[PDB]
Design a protein around this ligand. Sequence first.
Ligand SMILES: Nc1nc(-c2ccc(O)cc2)cs1
Ligand SMILES: Nc1nc(-c2ccc(O)cc2)cs1
Ligand SMILES: [Yb+3]
Ligand SMILES: [Zn+2]
Length: 606
Amino acid sequence: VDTCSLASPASVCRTKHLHLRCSVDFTRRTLTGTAALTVQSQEDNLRSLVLDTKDLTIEKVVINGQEVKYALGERQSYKGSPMEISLPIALSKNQEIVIEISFETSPKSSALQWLTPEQTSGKEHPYLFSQCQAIHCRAILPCQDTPSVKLTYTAEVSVPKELVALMSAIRDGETPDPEDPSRKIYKFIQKVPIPCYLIALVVGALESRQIGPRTLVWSEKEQVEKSAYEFSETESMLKIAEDLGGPYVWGQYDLLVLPPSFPYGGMENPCLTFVTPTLLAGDKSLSNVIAHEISHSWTGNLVTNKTWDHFWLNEGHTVYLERHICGRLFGEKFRHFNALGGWGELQNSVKTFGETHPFTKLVVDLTDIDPDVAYSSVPYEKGFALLFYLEQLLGGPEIFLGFLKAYVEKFSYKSITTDDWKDFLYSYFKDKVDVLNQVDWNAWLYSPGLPPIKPNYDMTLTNACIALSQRWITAKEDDLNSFNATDLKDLSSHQLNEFLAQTLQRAPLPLGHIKRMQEVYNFNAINNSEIRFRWLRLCIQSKWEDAIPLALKMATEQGRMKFTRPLFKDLAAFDKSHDQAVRTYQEHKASMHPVTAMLVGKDLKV
Ligand SMILES: Nc1nc(-c2ccc(O)cc2)cs1
Ligand SMILES: Nc1nc(-c2ccc(O)cc2)cs1
Ligand SMILES: [Yb+3]
Ligand SMILES: [Zn+2]
């Protein structure tokens, strides 16, 4: 069972389809309307069912044109409140009914961020976006909020007429709202069954530009041009992904560039990937995030984790595919560079969590744990590490990609656990079971800390990063004069980032070293978000007071948790900025994304 859902499990009943009809009210910061769920009984004599909700106001439940009895249970913290519905007529196995629930969301829905005009690029219109993963869909509409159930959907969304709605679905037309000529209805259809965490909505002053045969970029007008350039590799990435994963089944692959407060680098919403504007480096250097979101169209969206305990299936295989796309575009040495970078990231996470911490396990027990609190790079990189280790063990990339494609084919449109994956692994590689039995499965899947084996990594592109990092770490005062801008001349932006990543691992450095770095490399001028992030962390942890306003600024002017959370932690750990960190958080709290607010608050112990 899914310990994160309070709804009837899939073994009792299954939602087949959602029809959503709602209106977006910016003045009230509410979504209001009806969720019509087509539900199929999996049991004989079914007389009631339970749905997940969180901070939803229920007006009525209608079945067969009549109002029916329902009750809301006690709130169970982050899980929300179970909604039990008494069915008018007992259902047979496989019998389907339609249950139409009239509801309204709370302004504090953890699924939604409502932005005032002053929080947008254009400063004229408000903006709304959703983020349902893992378990926030219940904060938008009543549903079986579990990835074990996959449904198709249709929607009509009424918005002020000067604004545009988009969803994780194929755009199916727009018309004036016949109930209100100040409004427009946008229509949507998602014909491929999906888990409900992939339901998504944005409403705002959006413009679009075409960047490939099946891709429009959407954003506020101010970001469209930069976005179209930054993500121009999208179609070639899709073509490579199709070669590795099989047919792209989703029709459209559009991109939405969100305002700065979007909490993740991206979110793989079907037909409409959501991305952070911190990707806009000016040189396409952060495009691996697009590769990653594209790869989710197979691993995650087609083959889905059955519960959140098995989230590594989603993330590990997606990083694996992502690195193959990047490897095809830029070479195998680059795939290895990124892979080795990912091992370093895993080192950080384990060091930070503690090597006995339950959240360093590949498969976790999320019973009574808020998945938002458990989220980290561990399922990404430990997942990737396992697959890359298996790749090397089992005969190399070409062979392991054969498994990958077969795995996607096998489990498409289904939800699976680590058991299912392991069973199919053993089935596909039955001719190599002897090899497979040398894998320490208990350690890999269920033990905390670093993996029992480190894969083999090509070092070619990483050597120069390590060389320069070590020069700085081993430098004494009388050596600082030897550094100059020519040191970076043969480094790509990826290599500069990794140089900073390597050096940050040994932080603090002496304040004199860090001042010299700025003097010769002018890292303060770099706008690449990844590089700037690591540089500012390096400065704060090395106790450079001058970096305080820059770190505070980066932490608050964007909201990607990858950056914001460690920036606030570093600022709180520096005695000179500690009070500033806490105060700044308290001042920005109200206008932050609700999940980010909560997590930063936890991090700051406030
Ligand atoms: N065997 C060795 N691995 C490394 C290494 C480990 C992690 C990184 O991110 C980068 C390099 C240095 S020497
Ligand atoms: N392998 C691991 N997966 C997780 C995890 C699982 C589900 C989430 O929503 C967030 C994090 C933590 S450690
Ligand atoms: Yb010396
Ligand atoms: Zn992902």
